[PDB]
Design a protein around this ligand. Structure first.
Ligand SMILES: *C(=N)[C@H](C[C@@H]1CCNC1=O)NC(=O)[C@@H]1[C@@H]2[C@H](CN1C(=O)[C@@H](NC(=O)C(F)(F)F)C(C)(C)C)C2(C)C
Ligand SMILES: *C(=N)[C@H](C[C@@H]1CCNC1=O)NC(=O)[C@@H]1[C@@H]2[C@H](CN1C(=O)[C@@H](NC(=O)C(F)(F)F)C(C)(C)C)C2(C)C
Lengths: 306, 306
């Protein structure tokens, strides 16, 4: 028993972290086989930030201008190119610690672990969700760019996020490993704001199932609801609409607990309309929306990674 | 910016995890140099649980009775001994991935990361505190015993916890790496309950400093208090007494923010007496007590590990 925000083990990723310095800027890079991937802003000076011309700045750099270090060892760069907002630096040595991996673009509402790094060295690991507004609620400082987000499926690391930038109110934005931003953001120091966020309904439902599995059952009521009526309430409380695909994905937890998804929707509706009256669920006074149905199943069943 | 419950990177620990099977029971072990450390209950059958005689059960096992596997490789056991509640299995191969390490006994109020494992394979990593009642609020299932808790200081892993057992209400108990339990608990399936827990005051104060550093300042009031008057209030709300040692440890955060510790005590006193009136601090509706002053400094300054 017990339920905690859990991150994936970070060792496979730690093995791939390096530091990249160009001129005076140092940030993190991801070394897979013989290529180091990093944010393209490593080539910028403090000056260049308001409106950088990356293509232009990259023309005047050669391979030797990039100082890549893996631990205490310099990796010689033998090629470079830019793909969207990331740079790919070909090095003369393949990383012997490269895990089996994929580059994936995740969808909003999905979760991943972030290995926060500074100067190519790991600082910590935590679990995040891609918010509906394409930001993440992270913990990043100057020098954290190039830190990555990932998921693990058995022995395979799916890299889904590279950190680039911090938006007003302390939320974070970045790209996929092909350098394409999540959301309508650009890597320049200009006026940018995230859209209004929304609550990830299917994840809240998943977490209520987690509460039931742990014996925290007080919020279960005696009613049911249609999907449409539930969504009318969810809308009012800035919750995203629950789709039939979401209902289907909740199937394993619904079958395990014997609580129909629409019955648990009726219970959530009551929590939204009435509040929790000073009670907690799994120790939380607010409804939690950064556990997916798969996260819940994975944690409550002890899924491991090779 | 941003503040998240962050765990230490787990790679050094992942490198040390193995599976131990004796008879029909399988749990996790920690392989350091040529010794595998695991919970002594691996030698018990389902039967033996109410009142095992461990010394007796261990007499009738020889080295070959323990099947240790590191990934897909069996490690031959060449010696065994029991130290308190843990077994030490000498193997014929030293673990090449052994990190620099120490065994430490932590104090209540201190935090650590847990690498939750099943069958010698990691499932997830999360951050915990040793509660004042000597339990931890974890997430563990059948087969998780032998999972360890740890801290990292540069390149050195300080192992402080081995998981043994789950207490009523889904809280967890275990030992240090010398096999001595934290708290008044024993490794037998008998009626056991944790004492009443208390809130870790110095950690709540640390987290309020974290909020200030992040710009969440609404709870700062205009007052001060003596240490004694503060402790009279803390007592009433089941908060542990704040000691001068705790005040001193908050010194770096107090100096960074310019808020005297006793001034922030006055603000905490008001939160305890008045509540938060539906407001949040760092996104939380409850006061958080599982960040130490060092955790806050470490996270807000980007401390990395070698
Ligand atoms: C990467 N190391 C930093 C990480 C930031 C620093 C503070 N917390 C972070 O996550 N990334 C940057 O400094 C990027 C980078 C220029 C500016 N920048 C920002 O994150 C800025 N934000 C924006 O401009 C905004 F709001 F539009 F996202 C800053 C005001 C410094 C937080 C480039 C090239 C985008
Ligand atoms: C180790 N793999 C399991 C981990 C437990 C299982 C459920 N969640 C956990 O953390 N450890 C055990 O099964 C230990 C072990 C006998 C029983 N036991 C317990 O944890 C039991 N708890 C107690 O007896 C109590 F309450 F006194 F702590 C159980 C009721 C199964 C949760 C031994 C040898 C202590």
């Amino acid at each position: 028993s017990g339920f905690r925000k859990m991150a994936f083990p970070s060792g496979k990723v730690e093995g791939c972290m390096v530091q990249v310095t160009c001129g005076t800027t140092t940030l993190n890079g991801l070394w897979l086989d013989d290529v180091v991937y990093c944010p393209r802003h490593v080539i910028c000076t403090s000056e260049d930030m308001l409106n950088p011309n990356y293509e232009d700045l990259l023309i005047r750099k050669s391979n030797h201008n990039f100082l890549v270090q893996a631990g205490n060892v310099q990796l010689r760069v033998i090629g470079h190119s830019m793909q969207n907002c990331v740079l790919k630096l070909k090095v003369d040595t393949a990383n012997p610690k490269t895990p089996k991996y994929k580059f994936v673009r995740i969808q909003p509402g999905q979760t991943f672990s972030v290995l926060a790094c500074y100067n190519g060295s790991p600082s910590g690991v935590y679990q995040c969700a891609m918010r509906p507004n394409f930001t993440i609620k992270g913990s990043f400082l100057n020098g954290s760019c190039g830190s990555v987000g990932f998921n693990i499926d058995y022995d395979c690391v799916s890299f889904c996020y590279m950190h680039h930038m911090e938006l007003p109110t302390g939320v974070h934005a970045g790209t996929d490993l092909e350098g394409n931003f999540y959301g309508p953001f650009v890597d320049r120091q200009t006026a940018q704001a995230a859209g209004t966020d929304t609550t990830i309904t299917v994840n809240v439902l998943a977490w209520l199932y987690a509460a039931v599995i742990n014996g925290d059952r007080w919020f279960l009521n005696r009613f049911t609801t249609t999907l449409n009526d539930f969504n009318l309430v969810a809308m009012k409380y800035n919750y995203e609409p629950l789709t039939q695909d979401h209902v289907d994905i909740l199937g394993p937890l619904s079958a395990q607990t014997g609580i129909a998804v629409l019955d648990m929707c009726a219970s959530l509706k009551e929590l939204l309309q009435n509040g929790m009256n000073g009670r907690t669920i799994l120790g939380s006074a607010l409804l939690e929306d950064e556990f997916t149905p798969f996260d819940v199943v994975r944690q409550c069943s002890g899924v491991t990674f090779q």
